[PDB]
Amino acid sequence: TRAGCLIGAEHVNNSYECDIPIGAGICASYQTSQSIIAYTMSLGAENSVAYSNNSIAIPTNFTISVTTEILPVSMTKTSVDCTMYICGDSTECSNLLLQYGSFCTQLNRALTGIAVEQDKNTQEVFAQVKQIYKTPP
Amino acid sequence: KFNGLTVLPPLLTDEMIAQYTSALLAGTITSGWTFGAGA
Amino acid sequence: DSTECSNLLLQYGSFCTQLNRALTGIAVEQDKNTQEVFAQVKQIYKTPPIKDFGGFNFSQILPDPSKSKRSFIEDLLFNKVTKFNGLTVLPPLLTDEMIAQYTSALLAGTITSGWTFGAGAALQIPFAMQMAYRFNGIGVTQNVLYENQKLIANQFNSAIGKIQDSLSSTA
Amino acid sequence: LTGTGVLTESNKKFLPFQQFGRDIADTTDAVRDPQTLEILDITPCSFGGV
Amino acid sequence: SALGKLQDVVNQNAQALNTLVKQLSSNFGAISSVLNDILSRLDPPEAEVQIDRLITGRLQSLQTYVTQQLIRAAEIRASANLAATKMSECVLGQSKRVDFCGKGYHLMSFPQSAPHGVVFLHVTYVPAQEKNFTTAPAICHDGKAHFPREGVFVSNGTHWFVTQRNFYEPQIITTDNTFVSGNCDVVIGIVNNTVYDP
Amino acid sequence: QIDRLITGRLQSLQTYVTQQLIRAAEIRASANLAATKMSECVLGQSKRVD
Numbered sequence: 001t002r003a004g005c006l007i008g009a010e011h012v013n014n015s016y017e018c019d020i021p022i023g024a025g026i027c028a029s030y031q032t033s034q035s036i037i038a039y040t041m042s043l044g045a046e047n048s049v050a051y052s053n054n055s056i057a058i059p060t061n062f063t064i065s066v067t068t069e070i071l072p073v074s075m076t077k078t079s080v081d082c083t084m085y086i087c088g089d090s091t092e093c094s095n096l097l098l099q100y101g102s103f104c105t106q107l108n109r110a111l112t113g114i115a116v117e118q119d120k121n122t123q124e125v126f127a128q129v130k131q132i133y134k135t136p137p
Numbered sequence: 138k139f140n141g142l143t144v145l146p147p148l149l150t151d152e153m154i155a156q157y158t159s160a161l162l163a164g165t166i167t168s169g170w171t172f173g174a175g176a
Numbered sequence: 177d178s179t180e181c182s183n184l185l186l187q188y189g190s191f192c193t194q195l196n197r198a199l200t201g202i203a204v205e206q207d208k209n210t211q212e213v214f215a216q217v218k219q220i221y222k223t224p225p226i227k228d229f230g231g232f233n234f235s236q237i238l239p240d241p242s243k244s245k246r247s248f249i250e251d252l253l254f255n256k257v258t259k260f261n262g263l264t265v266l267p268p269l270l271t272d273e274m275i276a277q278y279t280s281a282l283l284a285g286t287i288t289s290g291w292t293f294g295a296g297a298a299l300q301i302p303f304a305m306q307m308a309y310r311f312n313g314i315g316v317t318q319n320v321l322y323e324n325q326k327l328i329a330n331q332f333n334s335a336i337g338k339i340q341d342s343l344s345s346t347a
Numbered sequence: 348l349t350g351t352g353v354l355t356e357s358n359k360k361f362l363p364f365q366q367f368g369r370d371i372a373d374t375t376d377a378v379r380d381p382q383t384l385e386i387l388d389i390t391p392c393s394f395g396g397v
Numbered sequence: 398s399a400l401g402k403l404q405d406v407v408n409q410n411a412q413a414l415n416t417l418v419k420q421l422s423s424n425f426g427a428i429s430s431v432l433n434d435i436l437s438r439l440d441p442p443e444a445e446v447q448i449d450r451l452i453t454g455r456l457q458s459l460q461t462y463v464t465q466q467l468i469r470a471a472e473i474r475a476s477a478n479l480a481a482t483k484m485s486e487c488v489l490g491q492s493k494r495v496d497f498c499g500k501g502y503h504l505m506s507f508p509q510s511a512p513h514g515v516v517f518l519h520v521t522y523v524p525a526q527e528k529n530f531t532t533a534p535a536i537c538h539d540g541k542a543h544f545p546r547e548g549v550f551v552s553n554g555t556h557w558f559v560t561q562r563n564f565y566e567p568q569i570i571t572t573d574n575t576f577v578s579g580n581c582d583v584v585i586g587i588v589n590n591t592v593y594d595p
Numbered sequence: 596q597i598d599r600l601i602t603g604r605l606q607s608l609q610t611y612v613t614q615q616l617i618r619a620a621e622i623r624a625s626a627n628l629a630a631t632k633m634s635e636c637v638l639g640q641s642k643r644v645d
């Protein structure tokens with residue numbers, strides 16, 4: 001292929017929707033006794049709209065679809081003890097580490113910044129209503 | 138979780154989140170959009 | 177190619193796995209980006225052979241079969257833009273011909289069906305009337321267009337020509 | 348093996364020859380008492396912010 | 398497999414934590430990955446070197462972890478701003494931004510909570526089944542042109558009607574559905590007909 | 596000597612990978628913007644000024 005050396009798959013002349021992407025337009029799929037085929041994916045059923053200069057198409061009926069959309073809003077608030085992480089309960093290590101300065105403290109400050117930004121995120125997304133309404137019985 | 142690896146709890150608990158979303162849904166159902174512009 | 181070096185490096189842990197995983201995340205997100213930008217049309221529409229568009233001339237942007245089935249301005253753009261150590265460069269999943277097919281589909285849809293082809297099934301409608309709707313959307317009654325159709329055609333054509341010149345001349 | 352913890356009588360069932368127990372992140376969590384064969388847990392004694 | 402986004406966030410954080418922990422069991426070029434063990438085996442002069450190596454290694458791993466977390470938190474904040482915008486413009490009101498609130502004309506939406514994230518139900522309206530009518534931009538009645546007020550002129554080959562753009566519902570062409578202008582001369586493709594008058 | 600060379604090359608590699616992470620975040624921002632602009636500006640007519 002134009003991607004590499006494919007080993008173990010038949011080469012079809014057809015073209016179907018891409019099931020497993022490979023690269024450079026090649027897609028492989030498990031089909032009919034069956035085996036693995038590698039084709040050049042097709043982009044969809046071509047279609048020629050019956051255009052003219054005086055013909056218009058108007059709908060007559062309608063459908064009420066209901067789609068879904070999922071969004072992430074917040075990570076998990078993690079904190080990391082500087083000392084107990086690197087050399088938990090080893091005085092020699094603490095006294096050696098003191099020579100590197102404020103690096104660990106800096107990292108702690110960063111992780112607290114993140115841990116507060118999370119609650120700000122959730123607060124901003126949900127708490128947009130002033131009162132707490134209630135449906136009628 | 139054993140080496141200073143603490144996992145703090147979230148300030149808003151799932152019950153309060155559910156209450157928030159029930160409020161928005163009841164508002165939209167009974168009042169349209171007007172509840173986002175005022176009363 | 178140094179076994180001693182590899183065996184020494186093994187003492188540092190999973191750094192290789194970490195870096196490889198990061199770069200693989202990036203390498204897949206790229207194709208996800210291109211997929212999300214272009215692959216928004218369900219079918220692959222096609223313009224009719226005749227070109228009765230109230231007097232407008234789209235030959236400068238519609239494809240021509242005489243090549244890389246790209247268009248003129250796509251050509252101007254593609255021309256105005258000009259290993260031993262694991263440095264592999266993966267190939268992009270969508271090749272330029274398929275990108276060109278996507279954009280030709282969107283363009284033919286916009287020309288022959290207005291916005292309706294983005295809300296469901298494409299419904300054809302004469303271009304002059306489509307521009308009438310587009311006008312009436314910005315608070316200018318239709319009769320202005322219907323009375324000034326040829327002048328608007330000439331202005332649009334001349335503007336397309338100026339775009340060709342600007343791109344072909346400065347880069 | 349060494350280490351600091353709070354040893355408590357467990358209910359895990361080792362094999363007759365096993366000695367340790369480990370977690371998904373490969374940390375010791377249960378030790379068989381080499382004198383009286385009772386399997387103890389290991390809980391790292393409490394720390395935390397103020 | 399619809400909740401891949403949230404499941405992915407959880408998995409990413411779990412793997413980051415597990416890599417951070419398993420970095421504790423590496424030697425970084427020292428003798429043994431345990432501190433107390435070297436503290437017993439070696440005297441302070443050499444315990445200093447072994448320690449210093451372990452400290453350099455663990456500190457580098459920790460900085461790498463914190464940078465990964467900073468970047469991923471910036472991305473999550475981007476997605477959170479997007480969710481806030483979508484709830485404020487798509488629930489608390491009806492929007493006219495195409496495909497911003499689900500494929501089709503937008504009617505309303507309802508939110509639903511979910512562990513670390515939100516889930517919208519975009520209620521949309523989709524036109525269904527069409528007919529090939531014959532049209533014309535305007536009509537001549539008395540030499541003067543007649544354009545439709547809010548609609549479009551269709552014709553089933555036999556008669557003419559004015560109908561709204563999105564739902565075939567033909568109406569007789571009164572002098573109220575339309576408004577007059579100019580004459581027959583200038584518009585292209587006009588058709589003779591009779592506009593009734595109430 | 597090796598250990599020195601390894602430390603150096605590893606640090607350089609991490610620096611490169613961090614540069615790439617940041618630049619890819621920026622390009623993904625611009626790609627989301629392009630997707631929004633195509634969906635609202637081609638597939639329909641917009642009224643958002645400029």
Ligand SMILES: *[C@@H]1O[C@H](CO)[C@@H](O)[C@H](O)[C@H]1NC(C)=O
Pocket residue numbers: 053054228585586
């Ligand atoms: C539409 O095209 C046909 C093709 O010959 C032509 O006869 C007719 O006059 C055209 N109609 C308009 C309104 O331009």
